[PDB]
Each structure stands twice: as C-alpha cells, then as structure tokens.
Design a protein around this nucleic acid. Structure first.
Ligand code: P8F
Ligand code: P8F
Ligand code: K
Ligand code: K
Ligand code: K
Ligand code: K
Ligand code: K
Ligand code: K
Ligand code: K
Ligand code: K
Ligand code: K
Ligand code: K
Ligand code: K
Ligand code: K
Ligand code: MG
Ligand code: MG
Ligand code: MG
Ligand code: MG
Ligand code: MG
Ligand code: MG
Ligand code: MG
Ligand code: MG
Ligand code: MG
Ligand code: MG
Ligand code: MG
Ligand code: MG
Ligand code: MG
Ligand code: MG
Ligand code: MG
Ligand code: MG
Ligand code: MG
Ligand code: MG
Ligand code: MG
Ligand code: MG
Ligand code: MG
Ligand code: MG
Ligand code: MG
Ligand code: MG
Ligand code: MG
Ligand code: MG
Ligand code: MG
Ligand code: MG
Ligand code: MG
Ligand code: MG
Ligand code: MG
Ligand code: MG
Ligand code: MG
Ligand code: MG
Ligand code: MG
Ligand code: ZN
Lengths: 38, 136, 57, 26, 94, 78
RNA sequence: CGGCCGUAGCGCAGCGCCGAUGGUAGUGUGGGGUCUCCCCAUGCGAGAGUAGGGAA
RNA sequence: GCUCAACGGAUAAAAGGUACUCCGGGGAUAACAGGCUGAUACCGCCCAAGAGUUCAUAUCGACGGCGGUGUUUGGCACCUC
RNA sequence: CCUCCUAAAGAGUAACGGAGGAGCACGAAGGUUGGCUAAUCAGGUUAGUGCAAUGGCAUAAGCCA
RNA sequence: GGUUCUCCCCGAAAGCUAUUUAGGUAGCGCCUCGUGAAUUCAUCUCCGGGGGUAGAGCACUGUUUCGGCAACCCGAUGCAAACUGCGAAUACCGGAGAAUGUUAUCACGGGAGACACACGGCGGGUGCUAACGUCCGUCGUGAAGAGGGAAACAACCCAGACCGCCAGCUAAGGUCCCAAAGUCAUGGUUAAGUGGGAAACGAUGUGGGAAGGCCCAGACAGCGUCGAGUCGGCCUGCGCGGAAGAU
C-alpha cells in the first residue's frame, strides 16, 4: 500500500475507487500500484 | 540563472505587487504558460521550470522566457538584530501579476507543449494555465 | 421649496469633514430632522454624508 | 545661414524692449 | 455568415460594464463611417463561441441591433487577463 | 553592522507660494525654485536664486507661452 | 513686425504631430470578502491603442 | 583671533579600575523562564530528472514547489529588576 | 552643512533606511558690450556648466574677445 | 513614594525645535481663564491655480528577451524608489455665493499640563508584505469613555452615560434550549457535523451552465451479436482527502 496525498492511475489496469470516504487506487495487474489517499 | 548584468542601484524598496499583468498574449510562439495567481518568481524557480520544459520537448522547437528577475531581494543573516542597515542581496525575483505569460513555446505539437508546461508548472509557486496564440 | 433631512447614524468615528457637514446642515443627533432650502449647495452637503442621512422631499 | 543667425542676434534686445514696453524703432 | 444579436446599452461606464459581465453579457462599440458610434451589449457565450472560429476576425459580420442589420468587421478585442472571456469588442462599420 | 548612508540636507521649502488668481502686493514671492522651471512674465522679476516675485500689486496669472511651451508667471495689474 | 507654438515640423501621408467613441487602469466617500490582494454602491476617470484629423 | 567638527559651542585647563564595592531608580532596558513570531530547525507532502541490469515511484529522490509542529538557532522587548 | 529617493502630484515628514557630496575656488572664473554654438559618427545638445546631485540654461546660465 | 472635604463648567499631550540632551528642561503646537476684533472660521456649490503621486508608458537614464540587419540600427516583449516624449482621484492655495453652527476664527494677556504613547484602517520604509516587531504619513478609537455586540476580550463593530421611571422605538448583533426574540415564509445547495482551523496537489463526491465528438447506415459496455444513448474536455456552486502534540 502506497499512502500518499496524490493518488493516481499508474497503468490502464488501475481503477480509482472511493471506499468509506477514502480515495483508493486498486490494480488487477500490479500490487505495487495499490494506493490510499492519506 | 537569470540576473541583470548590471543595475543602477544594488538594493530596492520592497514595494507592492498590485494590478493585472502587461504581456498577456502569446506574442512569439504558438503556446504559452500564463500566470493566474500573483506572486514572486525567483531566478532559481524560473530556471527549474525552464529545464523541466526543455527536457520534456527533447530540445525540439523553441522556448521563450517572457519574465526576467530584475528585483533584488535582501535578507538579514541569522543572529543579527533589527536595523544596522539594509540586508545583503541574496537572490533576484520577477514580480508576477495575474495574466502574465511566463513562457512561450513553438515548433512542437500542442499535446507535447501541454505536457512540457505541466512539468514546468509543478516547479512554480504560482497557479498557471495553458494558453494558445490568438489572431486578435 | 424646502427639504427635510434626518440623521440616521452616529457621527462617532466619522471623518472631520463629515462632522463639519452635519454641522453645516444643523443636524445634532440621530433622528434629528431639519428643514432646509433645496439648493445645489444643500444637495452637495447631503451627498457628502448620504450614508448617514435620509431626505424627505 | 545668415538670416537665422541674425534673428538669434536680435532676440535678446527685442525681448528686453517688449519687457520694458518700449516703442521700437526697428 | 456571422449573425450577432445585440441591444443598445442603457448605461455606460465602469459600474454598468461590470454589471453586464456579471450577468453573462459584455459591452461593445460600433464606430466608423459618419453615423455616430453605437454602444451595444452582446451575449458572452454566443460571441465567445463565434470568435473561436478564425474567420470571425477576417470576414464581415452582421450585428442585428434593434431589428436593424449593421454590417461590421471586428477591429479590436479586449480579453480577460487570464480567464477565457471577452471584456469588450470594437466593431468598425464595413 | 554599520551604514555609510544616514545623511540628508534640510528641506528648502521651495514651490509655489501664491497660486493663480491670488491678489499680491508688490515684492511678494510667487514661487521659489531651482532654475527657471517657471519664467518671469509681465510685472514679475526673477531673483538671483530664480525666485519669482511681484513687481506690481495685482493678481497672479500662470500661462504657457512661446515656441518651447514654457510656463510663465505674470501679475495682472489689479 | 507680431499673435500662435508641430492639425503649424520634416521628407519627397513616407513619417512626426493632433485625436475621439467605447472599454480598461487608478481613485474620493460608504460598505463587504476567502483581506500580501480584491469586490459592491456612488462620484471622478486616465495612459496606451483604435476610428479619424492633418501638408496651419 | 575657534576641526569650540560632540559643529545652539558645559571649563582657559581632564584618563582609567573596582569581583572590596555603595546609593537612588527601571521590567522605560539586557541575562533565565513565559509570551508573540517561525527566518532557521525538525517533521510531512507535491512534481519526477535520474539511480535502481531492464524498470521514476521495492528502495532512494536532482532542479524546484506546498505545508505542519513549536521543536533547535534566532528576532522582538509584552510580563516579572 | 548640501543633493536625490523614501515623502502618499502644495509645504513638512522617521529609522544604526537607500545613494552621493561640502568645510572651497575665482580680480576673473566678477560687471558689461559685441560676437559665437555642442557630443557623436549626417546629427541636433546624446555636449557644456571650476567641484556632488537635482532643477535649470540657446534671448543661452555654455564658448570667445 | 505619598499628598487629606464637596459640587458645577471647560478640557489636553505623549509632537516639532534645541539641549553633556534622550525617563530632565526650554520656545513653539495642543488645554483653560480674561479682554478685544473683522463675515473672521468650517461644511457645500461654482470659479481661478500649481502639480508629477496612483495608473500608464519606454523617446530619455538603466535594465530585459526574441527576430531581422557580435556593435549600431529596425521590428516585436517586459521591468524601475533614486526612469518620464503621458497623467488622474484626492489633497492643498485663492476667489465668489447660500444655508447652518452658542465666534466655531484671529490677536493680546493670567494659569497650566505635556514632550514614555497604544492598537485598528489606509499609504509606505525596515524586517521574512515574520512579530501584540520597528520607523514615518494620515484618519479612528483607547489613553482621558461608561452602555450594547464580538463566549471571555483598553485600542474591533454599534453608540457618546446630567438625574429619576416596573413606558415606547431602534443600532450593531440576533430570534431551538442555556438566553430576550421566527422551531417564520418561499426557492435552491450541502451529507462533510462541512458549517464549527486549512496549502501545493490529488479524486467517476454532488448541483448548475455553455459548447462538442460518435449514435437506430446500431453507437457505448460486455458477450457478428447487442438495442439507447454514450464519451471527455472547458466554465461555475457546495463538499472530500491532504490534516501529528503534549493536565
Ligand atoms: C481577535 N479576533 C479577531 C479573533 C478571535 O476573537 C478569535 C477567537 N477564537 O475568539 C481568534 O481565534 C483570533 O484571535 C485568531 O487567533 C485568528 C487567527 O489566528 C486567524 C484567523 C483567520 C486567518 C485566515 C487566514 C490565515 C492565513 N495566514 C496568514 C498568513 F500568515 C497565512 C490566518 C488566519 C489566522 O491566523 C481568524 C482570527 C480570528 C481572531
Ligand atoms: C471556531 N474557533 C475554533 C475559532 C473562532 O472561535 C473564531 C472566532 N473569530 O471566534 C475564528 O475565527 C475561527 O472560527 C477561525 O475561522 C479560524 C481561522 O479561520 C483560522 C485560524 C488559524 C489559521 C492558521 C493558519 C492558517 C493558514 N494555513 C495554511 C492553511 F492550510 C492553514 C489559517 C488559519 C485560519 O483560517 C484560527 C481559527 C479560529 C476559529
Ligand atoms: K508671497
Ligand atoms: K553637543
Ligand atoms: K572614577
Ligand atoms: K504533510
Ligand atoms: K520497476
Ligand atoms: K527581574
Ligand atoms: K567678465
Ligand atoms: K516645551
Ligand atoms: K493662554
Ligand atoms: K497608523
Ligand atoms: K473620544
Ligand atoms: K462541526
Ligand atoms: Mg473498513
Ligand atoms: Mg466603483
Ligand atoms: Mg532635499
Ligand atoms: Mg516659450
Ligand atoms: Mg486618451
Ligand atoms: Mg549640538
Ligand atoms: Mg541598589
Ligand atoms: Mg517591557
Ligand atoms: Mg527570553
Ligand atoms: Mg524563544
Ligand atoms: Mg516598543
Ligand atoms: Mg512571566
Ligand atoms: Mg511634497
Ligand atoms: Mg501630498
Ligand atoms: Mg509629524
Ligand atoms: Mg558670464
Ligand atoms: Mg466636554
Ligand atoms: Mg507605478
Ligand atoms: Mg524628552
Ligand atoms: Mg517621545
Ligand atoms: Mg508615534
Ligand atoms: Mg501598514
Ligand atoms: Mg508596537
Ligand atoms: Mg504589524
Ligand atoms: Mg497617562
Ligand atoms: Mg467602551
Ligand atoms: Mg463592552
Ligand atoms: Mg474572540
Ligand atoms: Mg469564536
Ligand atoms: Mg459581555
Ligand atoms: Mg421593536
Ligand atoms: Mg427565549
Ligand atoms: Mg421553518
Ligand atoms: Mg469543523
Ligand atoms: Mg479541506
Ligand atoms: Zn496499475
């Protein structure tokens, strides 16, 4: 999990999702691309 | 790093930074980076932004810097009291007002200019916007 | 013809020239109403302190 | 030039006579 | 070609002009020829879209004001300093 | 931690002493100046420090005159 | 000899020069904001430039 | 007849020490602590040149940018002489 | 003590604010009359002013007798 | 340091200049008392004035970038407290005219106090456009001013307390309960307790708007199928993350 103020799609398999008031990047391809805004 | 080669005087009154900019049109190139905010741009910031946009275009096309840092800014060293004369010149700034075209670019696709200026804008303390040359 | 002028706000904290204008109109306190001749000179005094008087014409 | 040079030569005295309000024999 | 609908301005000066632009309009002027200048107000978004076309500045335009059709060229444009907006346009009778 | 500045001279109270239309007595100074920013017109003298002064009683009059568009002060004898 | 002081001077409209209208900048007073700077009401309103004038 | 230049000129004529000290005063004014501030400091973040065989973002983060703390070095002299 | 800026288009206006000068010179470098016109490489004062800076200066206040 | 009864009227200053002067003092400024004198003074309107600030501009003094011809020169772009071929608002000086004002003005004389100012607004120097910092200009308040508001809070907002009233109307600020007054009306927005601490920057949060590209010649997604819209930028309202401190 990357915890950052700037969360972004890093590839075409990344998806932005808001869960429980938190912006997250989930990626099916790359676990390194998983991000949480914080 | 830009700096006047010579000046009449070494030190300048603080002054103020009111008003809207002169030089609000893309006058030289095809595309421009325009200040939306107000502030000071240091010579180091101008250079950091220049290097960023220049690398992004891989030295294709042409870049103009429309701003020039001609205002000397003094600072007092640490552990000195107030007064005892004005401080020493440490760096140079350009005063920026809203509307000022900061940089212009020609001889690249718009898409590449937009990317180059996005990378440059991230080096600057003032909000900016991408602009294109107009007929009138 | 005459006009009635009423002071609507305090003179406290006003500029010296505004206090001098109220004196020129003869207004003494909040709610004081004076009857004055309708002349350009009088209208200019009203204009100068329009924010703290009201005209009944 | 001769005329313009003479006009220059004339001016000071002429301006003085106007200052004095003198009737002038030119 | 380019049909601009306009109204004659009732008020002029800074106060009136800023009120126009707050209401999504902007002032303009038609001059030239011999007839006196005509101060007009235009709809902002309409003209802003028109003048994105390059031929707005080249070709003759028609300003329909109070029913009358007046043929003009764009002479000068004052743009907002940093927003994509028009402050003022000069039209010359042509 | 020291300054090489810190000097100035006394202010000289130059400028216009009697403005347009003011009634003056003969001798009255109209303007104190450095050089002839204003020039002496009718019934006005120019002193050694370029002071313009009234040579007659009357009203001060400012005028732009002549080919250099220079400022002249006169007294209209009144 | 003067008035006038570039619409008047140069060159031979090509320049100088003059110059609206509108908008913009600023700003007195009162009021307001997110107040390093702005905005609103009202009054005053450039400079530059534009149309035009112009060979006194 | 004055570099009476400390230039409205105390006298014609004048340097220091005191931790052996002393008096009148001042928080009108310093040293401590508090306060205000946050340049500096410390911590966090933005951009991503590049390093990382390859690959900016595992790890690191040049040139520059934005904050937080009150937390170092300081500024100020508001409280207490 | 002088000049400029700070100084908010009358005057004045502070700081261990920003920049420079004076503590003279000259019996002509003063008075007046007559005359004259610069830098620069055509130009038009971009020169000059006994010495700072500012304001002046062609009718010259500049240059010569 | 202290300076002892009462009431009534007026009411400062914390500035300039000089000072072996700087927390002292003197003259002037500002207070008071007395006397005398002009439409003397103020406000507004109109008229006569000089500006070189704000703004602007780039011929000049400097500075600055690009191009054409590394100088000059020509074209294009900016910058200036100590630049100005331009140039306000205001302010100031003078004149005229009303109305208003307990002469509000000036002179002379008796008596002073004061010459540590503070904060706030506006224009600035200094400092980091740091300081409840420092130094000027100017206005306001405190000082020397109570009352109401801003929880509390000299200096902010409203407002100037002669005395009495168990009357009434309002100002700022308020009206669910503490706590006086709308659980008021109509139309919207917000879901964050945002409101009620918030920056670069990040994001299919959500409202509004103006254009667009593609679409029953079948789009868009998913699997030729398929059967209605779909797509992503711009502008704008309100929110979200960014957000760690010691009883
Ligand atoms: C004194 N008063 C006007 C306010 C007050 O009464 C209170 C209170 N709680 O009652 C305050 O908190 C107050 O004293 C205060 O401390 C404030 C602030 O600290 C403050 C405020 C607003 C701000 C807005 C923007 C910024 C940005 N900063 C300026 C630069 F340094 C970056 C800072 C603010 C700030 O510090 C509110 C006031 C209200 C005060
Ligand atoms: C609600 N309460 C906690 C305070 C309060 O009672 C008042 C008041 N006047 O009574 C406030 O003003 C307050 O509500 C408020 O609005 C504040 C601010 O606005 C504020 C404050 C401090 C700040 C400090 C720094 C900054 C700037 N940085 C950069 C940005 F990311 C943060 C802003 C501030 C600010 O806006 C004080 C509080 C006090 C509040
Ligand atoms: K006089
Ligand atoms: K002395
Ligand atoms: K001794
Ligand atoms: K952070
Ligand atoms: K990798
Ligand atoms: K102590
Ligand atoms: K001689
Ligand atoms: K005294
Ligand atoms: K007295
Ligand atoms: K002040
Ligand atoms: K008071
Ligand atoms: K809350
Ligand atoms: Mg959970
Ligand atoms: Mg206005
Ligand atoms: Mg001086
Ligand atoms: Mg002349
Ligand atoms: Mg004009
Ligand atoms: Mg002395
Ligand atoms: Mg003792
Ligand atoms: Mg103290
Ligand atoms: Mg301490
Ligand atoms: Mg400390
Ligand atoms: Mg202090
Ligand atoms: Mg304490
Ligand atoms: Mg002055
Ligand atoms: Mg002034
Ligand atoms: Mg003073
Ligand atoms: Mg001589
Ligand atoms: Mg009293
Ligand atoms: Mg300016
Ligand atoms: Mg003293
Ligand atoms: Mg004092
Ligand atoms: Mg003071
Ligand atoms: Mg201030
Ligand atoms: Mg203070
Ligand atoms: Mg302060
Ligand atoms: Mg006291
Ligand atoms: Mg009170
Ligand atoms: Mg109270
Ligand atoms: Mg509070
Ligand atoms: Mg509060
Ligand atoms: Mg209370
Ligand atoms: Mg009621
Ligand atoms: Mg109740
Ligand atoms: Mg209800
Ligand atoms: Mg909250
Ligand atoms: Mg937030
Ligand atoms: Zn991914």
């Amino acid at each position: 999990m990357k915890v950052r103020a700037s969360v972004k799609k890093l590839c075409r398999n990344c998806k932005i999702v808001k869960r429980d008031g938190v912006i997250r990047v989930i990626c099916s391809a790359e676990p390194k691309h998983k991000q949480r805004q914080g | 790093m830009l700096q006047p080669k010579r000046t009449k005087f070494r030190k300048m009154h603080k002054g103020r930074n009111r008003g809207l900019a002169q030089g609000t049109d893309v006058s030289f190139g095809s595309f421009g980076l325009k200040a939306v905010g107000r502030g000071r741009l240091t010579a180091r910031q101008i250079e950091a932004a220049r290097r960023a946009m220049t690398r992004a275009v891989k030295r294709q096309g042409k870049i103009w810097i429309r701003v020039f840092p001609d205002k000397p800014i003094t600072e007092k060293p640490l552990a000195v009291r107030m007064g005892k004369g004005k401080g020493n010149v440490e760096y140079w700034v350009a005063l920026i007002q809203p509307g000022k075209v900061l940089y212009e670019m020609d001889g690249v696709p718009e898409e590449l200019a937009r990317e180059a200026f996005k990378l440059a804008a991230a080096k600057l303390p003032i909000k900016t916007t991408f602009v294109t040359k107009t007929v009138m | 013809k005459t006009i009635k002028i009423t002071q609507t706000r305090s003179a406290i904290g006003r500029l010296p020239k505004h206090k001098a204008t109220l004196l020129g109109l003869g207004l003494r306190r909040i709610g004081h109403t004076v009857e004055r001749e309708d002349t350009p000179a009088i209208r200019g005094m009203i204009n100068a302190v329009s924010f703290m008087v009201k005209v009944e014409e | 030039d001769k005329k313009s040079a003479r006009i220059r030569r004339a001016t000071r005295a002429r301006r003085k006579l106007q200052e004095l309000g003198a009737t002038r024999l030119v | 070609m380019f049909t601009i609908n306009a109204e004659v301005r009732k008020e002029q000066g800074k106060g009136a002009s800023r009120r126009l632009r707050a209401a999504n309009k902007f002032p303009a002027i038609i001059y030239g020829g011999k007839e006196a200048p005509l101060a007009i107000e235009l709809d902002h978004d309409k003209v802003m879209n028109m003048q994105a076309k390059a031929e707005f500045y080249s070709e003759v335009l028609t300003i329909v004001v109070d029913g009358k059709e007046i043929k003009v060229k764009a002479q000068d444009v004052q743009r907002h300093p940093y927003k994509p907006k028009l402050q003022h346009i000069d039209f010359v009778r042509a | 931690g020291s300054t090489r500045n810190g000097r100035d001279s006394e202010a000289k109270r130059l400028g216009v002493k009697r403005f347009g239309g003011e009634s003056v007595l003969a001798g009255s100074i109209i303007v104190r100046q450095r050089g002839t920013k204003f020039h002496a017109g009718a019934n006005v003298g120019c002193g050694r420090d370029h002071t313009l002064f009234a040579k007659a009683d009357g009203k001060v009059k400012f005028e732009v005159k002549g080919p250099k568009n220079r400022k002249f002060i006169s007294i209209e004898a009144e």
